[PDB]
Structure formats: structure tokens, C-alpha cells
Structure 1
Amino acid sequence: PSINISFKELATTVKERSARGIIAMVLKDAKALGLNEIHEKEDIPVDLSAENKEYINLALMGNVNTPNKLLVYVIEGEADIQTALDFLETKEFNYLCMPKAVEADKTAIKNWIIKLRDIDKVKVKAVLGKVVGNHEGIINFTTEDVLVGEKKYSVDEFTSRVAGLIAGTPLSQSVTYTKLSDVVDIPKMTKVDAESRVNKGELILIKEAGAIRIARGVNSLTELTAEKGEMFQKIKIVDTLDIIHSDIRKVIIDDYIGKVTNSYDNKCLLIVAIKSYLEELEKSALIESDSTVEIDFEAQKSYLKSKGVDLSYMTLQEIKEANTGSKVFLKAKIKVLDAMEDIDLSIE
């Protein structure tokens, strides 16, 4: 009879990402007792305390941009750490801060973060007041008696403020030497002590360039191993490494697990897609433009030895063409851009 017309517009998504610009903060209050996702600015539940409101206001503004997302959960102080851990496991978080983090709570937070990053591969970063832990995922801001806008501030308050500042920091930009107009009064503190504290792996504030700014953007990790090194001393680099890891994991989970068959051509298409994503990253200045992706040939040899098939009397290309038993072995080359805070040149 009558057949009708229905047309709905569609626009292709560009650069779909996850766990970006997310701020997670859990506060101990006996009035709200629940989670509150903040999507609109100046969104204040009436149940929240005045100091909690100040925490939120600190989290509001960023250095360059407003943080993409701020998530707040409320529960009683008792058993706060367990429930916060459960909630953060439930929903991904780019950053974490605690208004009333005790040393034991900070240690538990760091242990949970490192456990996820090492076993669950959940690359997350946490901001802590005074923790000398041996991991780069945590952040240690050791600046006592911080006063912002002629107002007394606890260490946790300003760590939350700095985390909010970091969330609004673009990756192509920097975290070092970020002047704070809100901070007007700081205790006197010598340049030599500033250098020593920075070399201790700590984050501090200094009065420089006619303003109050930080001195370095290094990780809280004091001891960087041989494989970690100088480029892992910087939070700026671990951030982009975590971002790329999460993006690759997300796209692989969305596309290839179960849904995509295991074949040589399927592997080639997967390599092409990964190369395309790396090209997308290369368009940004975060990493170098030169990179290569390869099938992990040595892993193929190891799989053959596990199977016991002799490696002799066939071409090495046949090894790549050989079935991998519902497994994939790959190799890739990366180089994240590392650049300079302050310079030193020569003249003639």
C-alpha cells in the first residue's frame, strides 16, 4: 500500500578515545553518600560540605582548558578505601585524588594502582600528597604550607588542584613552569633546596619569572631502572604511553577478539590498522613520525618449538604463513618525542 520515507543523518566519528580527561575524587561525608558525575560546571549537590565544595572548585579550572570530566563519589570515612577501590575498578579513571588520604590509605592506593598497571594492565595515574613510593604511576607533590589566594590550603587540597590543572593540560603543551595566578603567597624557600627537592623526585612550587610556578614535570618515581630511564622520569611520556596502550587494547577488544578469524590476511589487515593508528599518533607531535610494525618472528619460532615442528627445510616466510593456533605475535617500533624545558646554546 503506502510505503514511507525515513532518513536519519550520520557523521563519522573521529579519534574515539577512552579514559581521557577523567578526574576521580572520593570524599568522606555523612550527608551525600553516593557518586556524582560532574559534567556541567558549577554542579554542586547541596549535600556536599563547604570544604568539599572548595575541592570541587579547585578541580573546576585548569591551566589551559577545563578538565574533560570530573567524577565525585561520597561515602562515610569508614571503609572508604575499599569502596573507592571497588568504584574505580567499576568505572575507568584517568586521575585520582583523596581529600583526606592518610599514609596507610595512600599506601593502599599506590599498591592498588601498581597492581592494576602490572597485572590488569589498567594504566592509571594517582596523585598523592607525601608518598616516596617506587612507582611512576603515583604523583608526589611535597610542598607544605601552601597558601592560594591568601587562604590556607592543606597538601591534599593543592594536590587535587594540581591534578585538575594536569587534566586540563594539552599533551603537546607542558606541565613544567606553569605559573599559578591564584597562588599569591608562598613561604620563602631557597633555589638550592629547590634543585635538591627536584632531584629527589618531588614536585614543588617556586617563585620564578615574576610568578609562582613548578620547577619540573618528572614522575614521583625516584628510582628509574635502566629500562625506564630519563624518558620514563617524565609523566608527560608515561601519559602518552598509557594512552596508546589503552587505545590499542580498546580497539583490539572491539574488533578482533573472537569476531575476527585467525589468518595470514587477517593478520596483515590488523597490521595495516595498527599502522594507521600509529600514523594518527604521528600526526600529533607526541611521538616521532618514524615507526615500524612487524610480526614477532621469534615468537613464531617459539610457538613452533612448543608445537615441535622443525624449523629446517622451509622458507622463513612459511613460518609467517604457518598457522598460529588462534594466537597473534607482533612487533612494533615507537619513539615518543622528548623535548627541553630550558636551553643552553653556543655563540661565536
Structure 2
Amino acid sequence: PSINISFKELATTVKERSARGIIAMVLKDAKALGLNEIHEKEDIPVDLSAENKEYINLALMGNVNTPNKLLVYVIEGEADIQTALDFLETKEFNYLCMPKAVEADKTAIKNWIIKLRDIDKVKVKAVLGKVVGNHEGIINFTTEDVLVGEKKYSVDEFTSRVAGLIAGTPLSQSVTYTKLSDVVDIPKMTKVDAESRVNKGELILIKEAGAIRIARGVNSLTELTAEKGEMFQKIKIVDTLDIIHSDIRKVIIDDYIGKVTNSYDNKCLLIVAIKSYLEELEKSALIESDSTVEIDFEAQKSYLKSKGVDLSYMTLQEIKEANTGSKVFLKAKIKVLDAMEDIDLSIE
């Protein structure tokens, strides 16, 4: 007999964010020995050391925006790599940095990252000081004797600072020619040496346009295969590709596995949803406005050959109409619309 008006507010977001702006921080301290997720600025645990506090402060600010999420884990230096790997497996991350990453530790980190990206299909990135590895997911910042604010800084400190800055870098903007006001004193380098270092695939600081900025934003991978091409030599392209991969995988796991069945109508609905997501991406300047979603027809051919059904005496549309045995095959045409850093025009 007693009834009430129960109204619960609803908020709609046109843009959905997933696995973006994450910073993974692991430091070796004997006092805290735990994980700390920092969502509010100037949140400093008393356990962490002064150098760790400096690392946190460097990670605090970004070029355009403060990084969305800062996650810090603390454990003893001994057996740090195993626990760091376990925790990063437990909780997803976007970028990784280590204050005291030795060459063996950096190699192990790169191997774990590439193994994840190649088997687990988890698109993750790491920033490292001196690594010559053959993967584009890692970031190599080889700039020695770096001093910021008339203060001596180690290589790993500035790599963490640059990772935090990139976390705050918007996708429309490019990391190329981004000046740092805090950096005041750097060893003098020649233009030829800087160009040679950049052509080696290294990220360095240059004094240009009356400021100290980085020359380029290329990936740490020196050797890109024939298929990868020039654009895959840029972190900007791989970033949006990884974001699209993560979003598609997340929505697929949320909706289509288990909950949804396999049918031609289900295939059409999945195609429509993929097209809608691609249109949402097209709303941003990240990708081109033109893209297509199609059923992988040759994959259906291969599935029929595995089944053994003769290809003759039916319409080619029946191949699409034929059930794929709890499977879906799709084809999509996309192109990354990442614009231009430096240009060259002509006069008459």
C-alpha cells in the first residue's frame, strides 16, 4: 500500500574511453611495499623516498593535460621483475617505466611486452632508456647528460617524465617539436649529430625555435618490415591502432561471446555495430572518414574446404548464407588520418 517515486539519474557519454592514459609505475623501496593508485594530485605517501617523490612529481604534469591515471606499486628491489610482471598482468596499463631498469631487466620487460602483444593480443607500451630491441611497442630514449631545472637527472628519470608528458598529449596533437620549459641546461649538440641520432630511431632533445624540444616522435624500432611501412615507424599510428584494437576486443568480449549466438542476422548486427564504432572514430580526426566493413569471403571458402562442401551448383551468396559453425569471418578497410608535422611547399 506504500509506494514511492524512485528516480535514478542516467548519464550518456558520446565518447567511451578504455585502456587510455594509464601509467604503470614500479619503484624499489623497503618501506611502502605495496600498490598505490593516485587519482588526485599532490597525493604523496609518507613511505616513499625523496627520489621516488621526484619521480611522482615528474609524472604529475603533462604537456597539455594531467595524465588520467597514475598507478604506483612498491616492492623490494630483489625479485622486483616477477612481481611487477604479475601485477601488470593483474591490472591493465598503457605505459611502463622503471627508475632502476638494468639492461637485463629492460630486455626481460621488452620480451614480456612483445610476448603479450603477440600472443595475449594485449596492446601495451613501455618506455626504456637504452634498448636496441627489434619491436615498435617499446620506446627508447637515448639522451645522456640530461639536466632539467639546473638539476642533474638520470636517463630513467627523464624517460618517466617524457612518458608522463606523452600520456597527457592529445591524439590530435603530435609529440614532434614539443618544447619543455623546465629543461634549461643541456650539453651542446650539433645539428648533424642530432639528425643522425634521430635517423637511428632514438628520441633526443634539441634546442630549436628558442626552446628545448624533441626532434621527432618515431618509434624505437629501427627495422620496420616491408609491410609495416613508414607510418608504422611512428608511435602516433601504432597508438591509435592499439586503441582501436583494445576497444574492439573489449566490446566483443562484453557482448558477442556467450551472450550472442551465431547467425546471418547476428553477423549483420555485428557488422552494423563495427560500422558504428568506425563512424565514431571518424568523428575524431584520428582516422579517415571512409571505411568499409565486409565479411571475409575467402575465409568462408577455406571453412567450406575444411568442411568439404563442393563449391559448385549454388549461388555465391549462399556461401555467406551458409552457417560458419559458431564462427564469424570479417574484412575491414581502414586508413589512419594522422596529419603532418613538418612540410615543404613551393612558390612561383
Q: Same fold (TM over 0.5)?
A: yes
- Distance, in Å, in 1 between the alignment partners of 2:282 and 2:152 is 44
1:248 CA drift (Å):
0.2
For residues 92-133 of structure 1, what are the alpha-carbon distances to aligned partners after superposition, in whole Å with 9 as ceiling and x for unaligned? 001000000000000000000000000000000000000010
Q: Which moved more, 1:15-24 or 1:143-152?
A: 15-24
Q: Which moved more, 1:8-17 or 1:86-95?
A: 8-17
For residues 313-340 of structure 1, what are the alpha-carbon distances to aligned partners after superposition, in whole Å with 9 as ceiling and x for unaligned? 1111010010010000000000001332
| Structure 2: tracts of 5 or more residues without a match | none
For residues 248-294 of structure 1, what are the alpha-carbon distances to aligned partners after superposition, in whole Å with 9 as ceiling and x for unaligned? 00000000001001100110010000000000001111111110010
Q: Which moved more, 1:10-19 or 1:155-164?
A: 10-19
- Distance, in Å, in 1 between the alignment partners of 2:2 and 2:282 is 53
Structure 2 counterpart SS, 1:207: strand
1:11 CA drift (Å):
1.8
- Distance, in Å, in 2 between the alignment partners of 1:340 and 1:7 is 49
- Distance, in Å, in 2 between the alignment partners of 1:5 and 1:177 is 57
CA contact (8 A) 2:300 2:319 kept: yes
For residues 58-81 of structure 1, what are the alpha-carbon distances to aligned partners after superposition, in whole Å with 9 as ceiling and x for unaligned? 000000110111100000000000
1:13 CA drift (Å):
3.4
1:3 CA drift (Å):
2.2
Structure 2 counterpart SS, 1:202: coil
CA contact (8 A) 1:206 1:215 kept: yes
Matches within 5 A, 1:225-304: 225-304=225-304
1:9 CA drift (Å):
1.4
- Distance, in Å, in 2 between the alignment partners of 1:341 and 1:173 is 9
1:207 CA drift (Å):
0.3
| Structure 1: tracts of 5 or more residues without a match | none
Structure 2 counterpart SS, 1:229: coil
Q: Work out the number of aligned pairs and report it.
A: 348
CA contact (8 A) 1:29 1:49 kept: yes
- Distance, in Å, in 2 between the alignment partners of 1:161 and 1:244 is 26
- Distance, in Å, in 2 between the alignment partners of 1:14 and 1:323 is 35
CA contact (8 A) 2:285 2:338 kept: no
1:298 CA drift (Å):
0.3
CA contact (8 A) 1:231 1:338 kept: no
- Distance, in Å, in 2 between the alignment partners of 1:328 and 1:268 is 11
**Runs of 4+ more than 6 Å apart:** none
Match of 1:201 in 2: 201
- Distance, in Å, in 1 between the alignment partners of 2:96 and 2:338 is 25
1:18 CA drift (Å):
1.6
Identity %: 100
CA contact (8 A) 1:127 1:138 kept: yes
Match of 1:9 in 2: 9
1:182 CA drift (Å):
0.2
Structure 1 counterpart SS, 2:64: coil
1:245 CA drift (Å):
0.2
1:342 CA drift (Å):
1.4
- Distance, in Å, in 2 between the alignment partners of 1:2 and 1:204 is 71
CA contact (8 A) 1:147 1:153 kept: yes
1:7 CA drift (Å):
1.4
- Distance, in Å, in 1 between the alignment partners of 2:2 and 2:168 is 54
Q: Which moved more, 1:1-10 or 1:233-242?
A: 1-10
Q: Which moved more, 1:336-345 or 1:214-223?
A: 336-345
Question: TM-score by structure 1 length?
Answer: 0.99
CA contact (8 A) 1:55 1:157 kept: yes
1:6 CA drift (Å):
1.2
1:227 CA drift (Å):
1.1
- Distance, in Å, in 1 between the alignment partners of 2:283 and 2:39 is 29
CA contact (8 A) 1:200 1:222 kept: yes
